[PDB]
Amino acid sequence: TKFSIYPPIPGEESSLRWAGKKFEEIPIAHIKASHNNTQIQVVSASNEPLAFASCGTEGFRNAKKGTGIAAQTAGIAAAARAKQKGVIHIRVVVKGLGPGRLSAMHGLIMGGLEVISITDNTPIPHNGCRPRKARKL
Amino acid sequence: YHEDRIRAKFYSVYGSGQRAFDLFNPNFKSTCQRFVEKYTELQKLGETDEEKLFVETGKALLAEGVILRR
Amino acid sequence: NEDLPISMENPYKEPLKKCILCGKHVDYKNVQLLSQFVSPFTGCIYGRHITGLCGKKQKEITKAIKRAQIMGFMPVTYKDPAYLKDPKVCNIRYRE
Amino acid sequence: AKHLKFIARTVMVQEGNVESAYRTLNRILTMDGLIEDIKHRRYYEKPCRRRQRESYERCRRIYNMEMARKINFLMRKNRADPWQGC
Amino acid sequence: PRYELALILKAMQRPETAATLKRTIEALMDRGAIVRDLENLGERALPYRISAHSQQHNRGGYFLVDFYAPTAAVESMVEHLSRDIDVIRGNIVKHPLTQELKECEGIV
Amino acid sequence: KNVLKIRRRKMNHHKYRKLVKKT
Amino acid sequence: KNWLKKFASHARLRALNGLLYKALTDLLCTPEVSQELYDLNVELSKVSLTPDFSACRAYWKTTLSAEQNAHMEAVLQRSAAHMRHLLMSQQT
Amino acid sequence: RFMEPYIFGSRLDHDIIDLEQTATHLQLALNFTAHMAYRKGIILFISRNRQFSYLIENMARDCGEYAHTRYFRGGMLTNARLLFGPTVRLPDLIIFLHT
Amino acid sequence: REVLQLQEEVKNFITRENLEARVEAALDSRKNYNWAITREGLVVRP
RNA sequence: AAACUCCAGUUGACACAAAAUAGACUACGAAAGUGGCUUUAACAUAUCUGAACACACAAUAGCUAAGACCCAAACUGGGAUUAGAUACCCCACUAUGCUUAGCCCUAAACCUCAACAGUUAAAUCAACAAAACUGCUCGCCAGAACACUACGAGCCACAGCUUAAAACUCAAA
Numbered sequence A: 001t002k003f004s005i006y007p008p009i010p011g012e013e014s015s016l017r018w019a020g021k022k023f024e025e026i027p028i029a030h031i032k033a034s035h036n037n038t039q040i041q042v043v044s045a046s047n048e049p050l051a052f053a054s055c056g057t058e059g060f061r062n063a064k065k066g067t068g069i070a071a072q073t074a075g076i077a078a079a080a081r082a083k084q085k086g087v088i089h090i091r092v093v094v095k096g097l098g099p100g101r102l103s104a105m106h107g108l109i110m111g112g113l114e115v116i117s118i119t120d121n122t123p124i125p126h127n128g129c130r131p132r133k134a135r136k137l
Numbered sequence B: 001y002h003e004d005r006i007r008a009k010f011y012s013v014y015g016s017g018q019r020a021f022d023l024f025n026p027n028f029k030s031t032c033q034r035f036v037e038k039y040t041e042l043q044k045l046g047e048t049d050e051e052k053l054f055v056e057t058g059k060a061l062l063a064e065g066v067i068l069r070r
Numbered sequence C: 001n002e003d004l005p006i007s008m009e010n011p012y013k014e015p016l017k018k019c020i021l022c023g024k025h026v027d028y029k030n031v032q033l034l035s036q037f038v039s040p041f042t043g044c045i046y047g048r049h050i051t052g053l054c055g056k057k058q059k060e061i062t063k064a065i066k067r068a069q070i071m072g073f074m075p076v077t078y079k080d081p082a083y084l085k086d087p088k089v090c091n092i093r094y095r096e
Numbered sequence D: 001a002k003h004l005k006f007i008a009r010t011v012m013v014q015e016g017n018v019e020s021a022y023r024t025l026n027r028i029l030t031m032d033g034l035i036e037d038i039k040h041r042r043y044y045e046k047p048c049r050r051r052q053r054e055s056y057e058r059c060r061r062i063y064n065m066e067m068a069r070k071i072n073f074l075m076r077k078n079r080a081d082p083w084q085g086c
Numbered sequence E: 001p002r003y004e005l006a007l008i009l010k011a012m013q014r015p016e017t018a019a020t021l022k023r024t025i026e027a028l029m030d031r032g033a034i035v036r037d038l039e040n041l042g043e044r045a046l047p048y049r050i051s052a053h054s055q056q057h058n059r060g061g062y063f064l065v066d067f068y069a070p071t072a073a074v075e076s077m078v079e080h081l082s083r084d085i086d087v088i089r090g091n092i093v094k095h096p097l098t099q100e101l102k103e104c105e106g107i108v
Numbered sequence F: 001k002n003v004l005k006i007r008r009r010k011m012n013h014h015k016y017r018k019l020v021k022k023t
Numbered sequence G: 001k002n003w004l005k006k007f008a009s010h011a012r013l014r015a016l017n018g019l020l021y022k023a024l025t026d027l028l029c030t031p032e033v034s035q036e037l038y039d040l041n042v043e044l045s046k047v048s049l050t051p052d053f054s055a056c057r058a059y060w061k062t063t064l065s066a067e068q069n070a071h072m073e074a075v076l077q078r079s080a081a082h083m084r085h086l087l088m089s090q091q092t
Numbered sequence H: 001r002f003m004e005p006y007i008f009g010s011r012l013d014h015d016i017i018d019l020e021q022t023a024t025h026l027q028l029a030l031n032f033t034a035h036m037a038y039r040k041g042i043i044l045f046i047s048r049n050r051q052f053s054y055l056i057e058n059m060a061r062d063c064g065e066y067a068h069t070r071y072f073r074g075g076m077l078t079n080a081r082l083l084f085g086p087t088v089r090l091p092d093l094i095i096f097l098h099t
Numbered sequence I: 001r002e003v004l005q006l007q008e009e010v011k012n013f014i015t016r017e018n019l020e021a022r023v024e025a026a027l028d029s030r031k032n033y034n035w036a037i038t039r040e041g042l043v044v045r046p
Numbered sequence J: 001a002a003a004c005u006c007c008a009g010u011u012g013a014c015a016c017a018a019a020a021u022a023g024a025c026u027a028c029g030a031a032a033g034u035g036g037c038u039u040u041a042a043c044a045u046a047u048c049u050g051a052a053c054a055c056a057c058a059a060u061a062g063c064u065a066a067g068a069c070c071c072a073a074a075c076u077g078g079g080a081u082u083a084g085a086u087a088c089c090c091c092a093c094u095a096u097g098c099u100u101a102g103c104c105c106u107a108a109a110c111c112u113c114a115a116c117a118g119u120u121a122a123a124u125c126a127a128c129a130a131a132a133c134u135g136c137u138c139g140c141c142a143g144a145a146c147a148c149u150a151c152g153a154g155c156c157a158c159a160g161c162u163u164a165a166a167a168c169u170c171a172a173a
């Protein structure tokens, strides 16, 4: 069977399973990678918050907070707290183009969680609100 | 030239002849040129309907024994 | 003299090239056709350098896509998964 | 917000190759122009500056294509000298 | 002129859908329309979630109503569709067949 | 084009606007 | 503008250095400039601006192999101008 | 543009040179060349087409005339006195096989 | 010819009499406007 | 560093705001302008030219009234830097950007090319810009600066706009 890079459709029945569960039943790791901070939250397929860890909650402060190492630490801690609740597989959903976009995922993998799919949900307005003026630096 | 029209039709229907051109021969005669000569003869000894001339020329050339795959 | 060239239009003139949709009606309800010209992952409409369509049919497809999207016939942020296995007519490869 | 989730901008992983999937996602987001959109939307770009930028990029692309075509056309002559000596 | 009404109705049972369709066509006729044909495109999942009349919809029935009406009818009919509670979304467009398919000689 | 004429126009106008404010 | 002819024809310094370091790293993080550059995984060590602001020197960490270093250098030098253009277009 | 009067026509975007005019022009050119050779004038063939440099040099040597198929340094003709000597004799006729 | 075509067409228009029957028949029918194009410019029907 | 912690993340509900991709298109309109969807009206003239003031219009900014308020933001506060920094950087928040009804009538309002008709032959042609010209009409220009000024006149404008000088001075500009 040719591997399909596209996700399964919840309607159409598929044979892909992970620990006996379907795609729509796997927990979701929501990563928000801001410019100065990275926040990871693991939730269930039914939206029950299981674990939460950011670079700020792990002791990093100010400019150290928006680094790859801080995001890796936050991902490791989130993976640990989720492993304490029965999570082994996750679907990743990243939001933002901050420095910890990939480091947080690395930390999640290094903490014991298995990633089966990556999704991007960075907000892109189709011209809604007006951004701020450019800096005159 | 007038025969160019005929040539055009030929090169669109029977395609480029599998036989190759020899431009070094000052009197080289292609399959298209044979078709043109037969078409002109049929026009001069008969009526003027382009499609009928085309099919009659094809029939006469096939009778002569030259292969013409459409 | 009979051998002189005669005034004439080029008989060997090749027909002008036509786009794949030339002569065909583009309808906002034909979501299957419209989905062939949007990104599978983002639903963004492809440019003519990708679709290969002429200007008129590019405009027709763009207008039909916007109409279908706003009227509740087509998704906006992705290509409908039902049409992911249609013939690929766009010159784009994600190495997927 | 009102669309179905886990279809848009979603990549499946093959044999646990997470890095390859992430890089494919980056490729898709860049090829669809979403990365450029996000980066350009951080601060407001004035309409006149936007128009100038688009004009410059269009003209640069056209000029580069023409130069590349010229070089590709004149690369045919680049071979071993056939009349060496004379 | 000739118009096409694209109708996305609430996912209902057959009697309610029939009643809604009859009511819509009756409104069309009351506004001076000559209804040519009614086509059922089927019940399907909506492309996105639609909120109408304080209700959220994820599935709907797609119907087409071809008709001829005076120009003043359209606006009136639009208002009517805004009030019908069984109509998730209604749109009156100029009929696509009335648009002329100009012929092309190809790319210049 | 002569940019000095545009500069002189700028100076004269700015000087003029100051006077009307003062008086 | 008739582009065809044109084509054919200190505390502040430290802040700018840091800003440009972050900007260039974030540009290298993606295929925004080119896929060939992205596949190289070029890492930057620092950014230094000359005191008169005539050049921005971006120091890229070298690897152990030599042919890889040469290929990386070639790609980077070929892609410098596009990076400058992107940095100004994003209004960093 | 100035070659238009000598062109019979264009056959599928390829120009055809009217040979009836070529006959008269070649007649006049060959007559002039023969008369100059009869008068013992110096004849210098010139051509930068490297495919025919050897042939043109052989021909010039054979007919007892002169050839220049090589790079043309600035001032062969206009500055001949400095580059050959104060008493050099310049050609009486030059024939371009390639202009 | 326009008028003759329209005359024979009006015979199958929805009036107030056949509204119920026509609505039921439409509810018992399905119309498909979907069709795709190929790289050769050919239509593939669903 | 201030600021917030009625903070932050997921999910759901949810604009009087502005309109990714298409657009690598170069279209519409007298110009200004115009790039989300639908519908209704609808884009003058079967010679050409024809106005600072007549008749209609005219980006942005601005002025009256009422309304809406997400975001942005002149001003105004706080934080930081600096020799000073009330600028540049960070945070908050106004007039204003939006709707309705009236004003104001200005722009590098520029393709810095006046409108119509014609030619490509000449010496192509100061230069550069954007190949060189012809016929006809209207508008405008006769050294620089004083001067997008003074006075007069007109104006819904009152620190405003249009029109627009002279005296003194210079050999240049």
Ligand code: FES
Pocket (backbone or CB within 6 Å): C017, C018, C019, C021, C022, C023, C053, C054, C055, C056, C057, E104, E105, E106, E107
């Ligand atoms: S080429 Fe004819 S419609 Fe596109």
Ligand SMILES: [Mg+2]
Pocket (backbone or CB within 6 Å): none
């Ligand atoms: Mg007039």
Ligand SMILES: [Mg+2]
Pocket (backbone or CB within 6 Å): J051
């Ligand atoms: Mg006057």
Ligand SMILES: [Mg+2]
Pocket (backbone or CB within 6 Å): J052
């Ligand atoms: Mg005026």
Ligand SMILES: [Mg+2]
Pocket (backbone or CB within 6 Å): none
């Ligand atoms: Mg105005």
Ligand SMILES: [Mg+2]
Pocket (backbone or CB within 6 Å): none
């Ligand atoms: Mg406000």
Ligand SMILES: [Mg+2]
Pocket (backbone or CB within 6 Å): J110
């Ligand atoms: Mg301009």
Ligand SMILES: [Mg+2]
Pocket (backbone or CB within 6 Å): J114, J115
């Ligand atoms: Mg005029």
Ligand SMILES: [Mg+2]
Pocket (backbone or CB within 6 Å): J148
């Ligand atoms: Mg002024």
Ligand SMILES: [Mg+2]
Pocket (backbone or CB within 6 Å): none
């Ligand atoms: Mg006055």
Ligand SMILES: [Mg+2]
Pocket (backbone or CB within 6 Å): none
């Ligand atoms: Mg005044």
